[PDB]
Amino acid sequence: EGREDPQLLVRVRGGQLRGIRLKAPGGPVSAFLGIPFAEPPVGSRRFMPPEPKRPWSGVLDATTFQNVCYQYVDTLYPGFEGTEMWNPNRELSEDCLYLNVWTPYPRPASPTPVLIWIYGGGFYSGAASLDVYDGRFLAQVEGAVLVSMNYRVGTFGFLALPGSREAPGNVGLLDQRLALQWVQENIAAFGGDPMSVTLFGESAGAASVGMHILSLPSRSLFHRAVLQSGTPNGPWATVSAGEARRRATLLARLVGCPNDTELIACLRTRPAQDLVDHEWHVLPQESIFRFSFVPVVDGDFLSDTPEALINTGDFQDLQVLVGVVKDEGSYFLVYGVPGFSKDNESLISRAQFLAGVRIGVPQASDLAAEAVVLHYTDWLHPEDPTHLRDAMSAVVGDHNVVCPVAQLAGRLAAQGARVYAYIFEHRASTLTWPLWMGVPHGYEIEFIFGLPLDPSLNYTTEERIFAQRLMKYWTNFARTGDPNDPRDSKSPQWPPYTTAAQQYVSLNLKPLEVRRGLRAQTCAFWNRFLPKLLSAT
Amino acid sequence: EDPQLLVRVRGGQLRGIRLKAPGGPVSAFLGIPFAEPPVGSRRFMPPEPKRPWSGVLDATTFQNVCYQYVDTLYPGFEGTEMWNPNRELSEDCLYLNVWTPYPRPASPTPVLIWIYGGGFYSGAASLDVYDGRFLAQVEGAVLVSMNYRVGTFGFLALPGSREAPGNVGLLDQRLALQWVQENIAAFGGDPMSVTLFGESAGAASVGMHILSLPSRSLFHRAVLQSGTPNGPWATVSAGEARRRATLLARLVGCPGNDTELIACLRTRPAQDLVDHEWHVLPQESIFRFSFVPVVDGDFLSDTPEALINTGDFQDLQVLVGVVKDEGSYFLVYGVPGFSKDNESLISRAQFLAGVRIGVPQASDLAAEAVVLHYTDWLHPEDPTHLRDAMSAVVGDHNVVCPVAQLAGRLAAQGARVYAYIFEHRASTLTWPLWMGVPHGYEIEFIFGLPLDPSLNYTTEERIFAQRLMKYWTNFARTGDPNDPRDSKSPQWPPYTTAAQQYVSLNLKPLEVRRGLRAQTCAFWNRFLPKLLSAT
Ligand SMILES: CN(Cc1ccccc1)Cc1ccc(COc2ccc3c(CO)cc(=O)oc3c2)cc1
Ligand SMILES: CN(Cc1ccccc1)Cc1ccc(COc2ccc3c(CO)cc(=O)oc3c2)cc1
Ligand SMILES: *[C@@H]1O[C@H](CO)[C@@H](O)[C@H](O)[C@H]1NC(C)=O
Ligand SMILES: *[C@@H]1O[C@H](CO)[C@@H](O)[C@H](O)[C@H]1NC(C)=O
Ligand SMILES: *[C@@H]1O[C@H](CO)[C@@H](O)[C@H](O)[C@H]1NC(C)=O
Ligand SMILES: *[C@@H]1O[C@H](CO)[C@@H](O)[C@H](O)[C@H]1NC(C)=O
């Protein structure tokens, strides 16, 4: 200390930090990167709940991103930016429980609402250091304090032998909760308001946010929630205790481990890469949009199934923003549904469609799988390849995202929550995936964080204006529980989603358009009829 | 003394009557016996051909209508009375009628044979809606309609018994068809161009003559208006026919042997049988009738579904279609919350209760499947939507989707198929507006009743009726409803499995549409059978 930037040195509960002054297109921001919030969950602490980071001495350098939690590296289209942008961009390590903070430069004088980002990645992948989650634009343009944390994924975050001491499960969610607690104690040192904390996340990150809504100890750590293209309810976000026990035991056998304590002791001796090499092999069926190690309904973090909790909980004090992208399902068809590729138009046959439905809803009986096929078939053109391709995408997107959030918006709204719903319909001019995928899963994030404002990124001017609109929507919601701008009047209003009117808005380059019904007919099939059909068969 | 009112058929001489139609006279021969009166020991028995008669038989007047139930729902309301018997009831009722132009045609003329509806429990060829004078006068057709036995007298069956073999009401129709072959040429008709057309149960009967091979040599073309041989109501299994007959016999005090049972039923006055007719249905129902054709293994060698799925229909041309609101008429006959005088705005609970009546064969899960399919999930409680959906459940389940299934199966297996939807509501209709275009109210337009100035139709409805008369008669002449003189687009395309094209019959010009309730009928025809099966 002495000759450095005095506006970049801050003290948190664990010691002193030195941040870095970053350039955003419109000015500087303060960045505090790689702050440790837990003891490294390594060695005998693998699979264990996180322990609070013990204080350090001296000034911790917080100028670069820290390790990415150990995870699978996608190799589907090697070197294709569509896949690589999601891949880890630092070293893989079990030592990975660090978080990041962006604030205005200099730091705000008055307490500023806080946004906490929870990344997605199917609970098997992801990192708070990816370019798509760059908090420098929200920090600079909106004056927000943004926090993002790494949490353990895959086996390290979610392998569970339910009821055991050494692998209780959901420790990846406990990693997230510990970071929320860290924001409670320390974010005031940066100018953030701990009494105005909004969680927002996407895909498994959105499901994570929803699970903090449903867990008691997490509810006192935040005040508002945004769930983008993900829900705690639905077919992929959770598994039963019995099913988590079987996948854990099977993976242990696949890595040579054949009493719970002896089992996890052996797992803790295996190299991390051994666990990643086998995690995908324990799914009960050939499937898309399902992940081996996800939150487990333990009777602890989750006292019951998410479906049961959103049916009975009280959410009057809660404001929630939820939505989907236009083509939630298309991204998943290229990862194992025959007939589908990023390099052709993926015009499939009726036979390929029927095979895809068995993969897309792998829990379905033969009768239930039929019911899906009859509903999604266009009976005036039942063999048309373009419709069959688009229907296969819609089946995956509706089943895993659109109808889960349509269900949760309705439940939360009926339990007294303030809900705002959107559909994101703009395809980025920079998108590298083919046209037939439309607006795929995850490609609204770069607009929420305001990447189009980076002039070196070749977005169009209207995409620059568009991203600024979304940034104001998201930050107005964090500030007020209401995405609408108080100053405005002429701009169309975003009404709350209600059971009586089921209103949502389209998010595209045109002004806000209000629509009614979130795929209402088709989601009645998924949310009301199909669960009753599955009991009978 | 009028020589064109005297015709000799193989049973002897007849004298008809000159009738006044708006454009000119017509020869009408009404009350021609085609069968021995099925009375006494001939009750429930197949018809026997009528024996020759001396002198000039007087064919000037409508004969008795077959003994049947007299509807009492809205007593004296024209909407219900127009279907009630308008001649005396009698088991002595096997007679047919013939309309020809006046003078009787020079060249042989294509014959249309009408088969009335009435749920196989009612109906008569003497109703005003079936007045054949307009088609005979305007289009120069030879029009024939017959009475056939309905209710227990037509279709109560002890399957396998000699005394009550079943389907005798259909045999009544077939005998009248043979009569047309042997005699219509004496009236100027062409026995080599005979077109059957009927509505509702009449349409179903037409479809069963398609599916019964001895009938097939008696006609060349068919029109099925708002009814099919396939579907949930038009037939019953032999086991269910024996159950219903056995319970009616017990209800009228008849107790063992097939022969002993049928004998006692023959000793019962007709009204006794009609009194308990309706109390033998297995469930509380709508659009279900107690005594209908039976899958006997004889007249119908298999279920109509099995027969349309495997038959050879190459040499066949068919016209098929529906009205816009097939099911609305049936709701006011037992569905709580529905009334002719009320607007029938129903609650959701009444809607769930109504679906169990409309699909009486449905398990709890199959009823929930229909409920969730037909609910409008943006307005799941709106009573106007729930009312209109109840009418659509009954209409699609019983008519529209059976029609679409038949049309597709016939077209796929050699037949030439033309399909329509009839969307005009008569300005003279007395049912409430919420019923729309109810089951059976295209008939008056096809027979040309608007051309009668005294019935107060609108002038466009007259032009409309003439268009429909030309579609039907051009179909009878050619197997193609398109006017060969008219040389403009749009033409009426055939219905195929691939394109699924049909036309809308309204006061606007013909409009071609593709897919006859395709998504919803996929539910009824493809999914629901599999569900009911595995439940
Ligand atoms: C590429 N990814 C981009 C993305 C979008 C949004 C948020 C975060 C990342 C979307 C995606 C994810 C997964 C798939 C296929 O499903 C998988 C892939 C890999 C695994 C792995 C690999 O070990 C383990 C597992 O349990 O389940 C998996 C399930 C396709 C597309
Ligand atoms: C009145 N009818 C008018 C009509 C329309 C189209 C063609 C012919 C007649 C349509 C109609 C028919 C039947 C009903 C209700 O269902 C019935 C009514 C009476 C019976 C009877 C009465 O004994 C016996 C039976 O087995 O089943 C029935 C079933 C409602 C509306
Ligand atoms: C698209 O490409 C994949 C992989 O090359 C292939 O399996 C699929 O059949 C292709 N589809 C079409 C319609 O060409
Ligand atoms: C933007 O375009 C320029 C040239 O037009 C190119 O050199 C640059 O790499 C592009 N940037 C991105 C992010 O694609
Ligand atoms: C409509 O009318 C009938 C008889 O007049 C009545 O029983 C029925 O309840 C009415 N419908 C409603 C919704 O009240
Ligand atoms: C037609 O209307 C007139 C009154 O304008 C009436 O006298 C006549 O009876 C009506 N005809 C019929 C068939 O109802």
Side-chain angles (χ1 to χ4, degrees), chain B residues 439-459:
Chain B
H439 186 74
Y441 287 102
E442 87 280 22
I443 300 175
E444 57 197 75
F445 289 97
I446 307 190
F447 275 82
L449 268 79
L451 280 74
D452 190 339
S454 67
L455 304 160
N456 297 331
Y457 284 96
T458 78
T459 176

Short mmCIF file of all heavy atoms in Angstrom, two decimals, chain B residues 439-459:
data_model
loop_
_atom_site.label_atom_id
_atom_site.label_comp_id
_atom_site.label_asym_id
_atom_site.label_seq_id
_atom_site.Cartn_x
_atom_site.Cartn_y
_atom_site.Cartn_z
N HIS B 439 -78.03 -30.13 -36.23
CA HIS B 439 -78.17 -31.44 -36.86
C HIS B 439 -79.51 -31.59 -37.57
O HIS B 439 -80.56 -31.63 -36.93
CB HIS B 439 -78.00 -32.51 -35.78
CG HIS B 439 -77.97 -33.91 -36.30
ND1 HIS B 439 -76.89 -34.44 -36.97
CD2 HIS B 439 -78.88 -34.91 -36.22
CE1 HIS B 439 -77.14 -35.70 -37.29
NE2 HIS B 439 -78.34 -36.01 -36.84
N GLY B 440 -79.48 -31.66 -38.90
CA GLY B 440 -80.66 -31.95 -39.69
C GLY B 440 -81.24 -30.79 -40.47
O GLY B 440 -82.23 -30.99 -41.19
N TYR B 441 -80.67 -29.59 -40.37
CA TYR B 441 -81.28 -28.42 -40.98
C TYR B 441 -80.59 -27.98 -42.26
O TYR B 441 -80.73 -26.83 -42.68
CB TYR B 441 -81.35 -27.28 -39.96
CG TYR B 441 -82.42 -27.58 -38.94
CD1 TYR B 441 -82.09 -28.07 -37.68
CD2 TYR B 441 -83.76 -27.44 -39.27
CE1 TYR B 441 -83.08 -28.37 -36.76
CE2 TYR B 441 -84.75 -27.74 -38.36
CZ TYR B 441 -84.40 -28.20 -37.11
OH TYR B 441 -85.39 -28.50 -36.20
N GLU B 442 -79.85 -28.89 -42.89
CA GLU B 442 -79.49 -28.76 -44.30
C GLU B 442 -80.49 -29.45 -45.21
O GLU B 442 -80.52 -29.16 -46.41
CB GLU B 442 -78.10 -29.34 -44.54
CG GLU B 442 -78.09 -30.83 -44.85
CD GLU B 442 -78.19 -31.70 -43.60
OE1 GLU B 442 -78.67 -31.21 -42.56
OE2 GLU B 442 -77.80 -32.89 -43.67
N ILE B 443 -81.32 -30.34 -44.65
CA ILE B 443 -82.18 -31.19 -45.47
C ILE B 443 -83.18 -30.36 -46.26
O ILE B 443 -83.37 -30.57 -47.47
CB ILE B 443 -82.90 -32.23 -44.58
CG1 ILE B 443 -81.88 -33.11 -43.86
CG2 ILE B 443 -83.85 -33.07 -45.41
CD1 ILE B 443 -82.50 -34.08 -42.87
N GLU B 444 -83.82 -29.39 -45.60
CA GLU B 444 -84.84 -28.59 -46.27
C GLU B 444 -84.27 -27.82 -47.46
O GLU B 444 -85.01 -27.51 -48.40
CB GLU B 444 -85.49 -27.62 -45.28
CG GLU B 444 -84.52 -26.70 -44.58
CD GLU B 444 -85.11 -26.06 -43.34
OE1 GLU B 444 -85.23 -26.75 -42.31
OE2 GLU B 444 -85.47 -24.86 -43.40
N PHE B 445 -82.98 -27.51 -47.43
CA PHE B 445 -82.36 -26.80 -48.55
C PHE B 445 -82.02 -27.73 -49.70
O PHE B 445 -82.08 -27.33 -50.86
CB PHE B 445 -81.10 -26.08 -48.07
CG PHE B 445 -81.38 -24.90 -47.20
CD1 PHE B 445 -81.33 -25.01 -45.82
CD2 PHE B 445 -81.72 -23.67 -47.75
CE1 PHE B 445 -81.59 -23.92 -45.01
CE2 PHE B 445 -81.99 -22.58 -46.95
CZ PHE B 445 -81.93 -22.71 -45.58
N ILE B 446 -81.65 -28.98 -49.39
CA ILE B 446 -81.29 -29.92 -50.44
C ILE B 446 -82.52 -30.40 -51.19
O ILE B 446 -82.45 -30.65 -52.40
CB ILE B 446 -80.50 -31.09 -49.81
CG1 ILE B 446 -79.33 -30.53 -49.00
CG2 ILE B 446 -80.02 -32.06 -50.89
CD1 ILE B 446 -78.35 -31.56 -48.54
N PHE B 447 -83.66 -30.51 -50.51
CA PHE B 447 -84.90 -30.91 -51.17
C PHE B 447 -85.59 -29.76 -51.88
O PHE B 447 -86.59 -29.99 -52.57
CB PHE B 447 -85.85 -31.54 -50.15
CG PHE B 447 -85.61 -33.00 -49.92
CD1 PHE B 447 -84.62 -33.42 -49.04
CD2 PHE B 447 -86.36 -33.96 -50.58
CE1 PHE B 447 -84.39 -34.77 -48.82
CE2 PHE B 447 -86.14 -35.31 -50.36
CZ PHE B 447 -85.15 -35.71 -49.49
N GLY B 448 -85.08 -28.53 -51.74
CA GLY B 448 -85.61 -27.41 -52.49
C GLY B 448 -86.84 -26.75 -51.91
O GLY B 448 -87.59 -26.10 -52.65
N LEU B 449 -87.07 -26.88 -50.61
CA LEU B 449 -88.22 -26.24 -49.99
C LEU B 449 -88.22 -24.71 -50.11
O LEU B 449 -89.31 -24.14 -50.25
CB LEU B 449 -88.32 -26.65 -48.51
CG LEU B 449 -89.20 -27.87 -48.23
CD1 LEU B 449 -88.45 -29.16 -48.55
CD2 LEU B 449 -89.68 -27.87 -46.79
N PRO B 450 -87.07 -24.00 -50.04
CA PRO B 450 -87.11 -22.54 -50.23
C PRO B 450 -87.78 -22.08 -51.52
O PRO B 450 -88.28 -20.95 -51.59
CB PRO B 450 -85.63 -22.15 -50.21
CG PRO B 450 -85.02 -23.14 -49.29
CD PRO B 450 -85.75 -24.43 -49.53
N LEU B 451 -87.81 -22.94 -52.54
CA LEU B 451 -88.46 -22.59 -53.79
C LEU B 451 -89.97 -22.47 -53.66
O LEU B 451 -90.62 -22.00 -54.60
CB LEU B 451 -88.10 -23.60 -54.88
CG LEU B 451 -86.73 -23.43 -55.55
CD1 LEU B 451 -85.60 -23.86 -54.63
CD2 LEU B 451 -86.67 -24.18 -56.87
N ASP B 452 -90.54 -22.89 -52.53
CA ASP B 452 -91.95 -22.68 -52.23
C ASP B 452 -92.11 -21.28 -51.65
O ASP B 452 -91.68 -21.03 -50.52
CB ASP B 452 -92.46 -23.75 -51.26
CG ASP B 452 -93.98 -23.72 -51.09
OD1 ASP B 452 -94.61 -22.68 -51.37
OD2 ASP B 452 -94.54 -24.75 -50.66
N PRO B 453 -92.72 -20.35 -52.39
CA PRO B 453 -92.81 -18.97 -51.89
C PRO B 453 -93.57 -18.83 -50.59
O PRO B 453 -93.31 -17.88 -49.83
CB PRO B 453 -93.52 -18.23 -53.04
CG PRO B 453 -93.29 -19.09 -54.25
CD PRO B 453 -93.29 -20.49 -53.74
N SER B 454 -94.50 -19.74 -50.30
CA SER B 454 -95.36 -19.59 -49.13
C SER B 454 -94.65 -19.87 -47.81
O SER B 454 -95.22 -19.55 -46.76
CB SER B 454 -96.59 -20.49 -49.27
OG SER B 454 -96.22 -21.86 -49.21
N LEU B 455 -93.45 -20.44 -47.83
CA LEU B 455 -92.74 -20.77 -46.60
C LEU B 455 -91.81 -19.65 -46.14
O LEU B 455 -91.10 -19.83 -45.14
CB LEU B 455 -91.95 -22.07 -46.77
CG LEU B 455 -92.78 -23.28 -47.20
CD1 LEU B 455 -91.88 -24.34 -47.81
CD2 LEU B 455 -93.57 -23.85 -46.03
N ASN B 456 -91.78 -18.52 -46.84
CA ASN B 456 -91.19 -17.28 -46.35
C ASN B 456 -89.67 -17.35 -46.20
O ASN B 456 -89.11 -16.71 -45.30
CB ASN B 456 -91.84 -16.85 -45.03
CG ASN B 456 -93.32 -16.54 -45.18
OD1 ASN B 456 -93.77 -16.12 -46.24
ND2 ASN B 456 -94.08 -16.75 -44.10
N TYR B 457 -88.99 -18.11 -47.05
CA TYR B 457 -87.53 -18.06 -47.07
C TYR B 457 -87.06 -16.79 -47.78
O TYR B 457 -87.82 -16.13 -48.49
CB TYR B 457 -86.96 -19.29 -47.78
CG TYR B 457 -86.98 -20.57 -46.98
CD1 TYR B 457 -88.02 -21.49 -47.14
CD2 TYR B 457 -85.97 -20.88 -46.09
CE1 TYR B 457 -88.04 -22.67 -46.43
CE2 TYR B 457 -85.99 -22.07 -45.36
CZ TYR B 457 -87.03 -22.95 -45.54
OH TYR B 457 -87.06 -24.13 -44.83
N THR B 458 -85.79 -16.45 -47.57
CA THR B 458 -85.22 -15.29 -48.23
C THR B 458 -84.83 -15.63 -49.66
O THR B 458 -84.59 -16.79 -50.01
CB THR B 458 -84.01 -14.75 -47.47
OG1 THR B 458 -82.87 -15.57 -47.74
CG2 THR B 458 -84.28 -14.74 -45.97
N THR B 459 -84.75 -14.59 -50.50
CA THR B 459 -84.52 -14.80 -51.93
C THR B 459 -83.14 -15.39 -52.20
O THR B 459 -82.98 -16.16 -53.15
CB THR B 459 -84.73 -13.50 -52.70
OG1 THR B 459 -84.42 -13.71 -54.09
CG2 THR B 459 -83.85 -12.39 -52.15
#
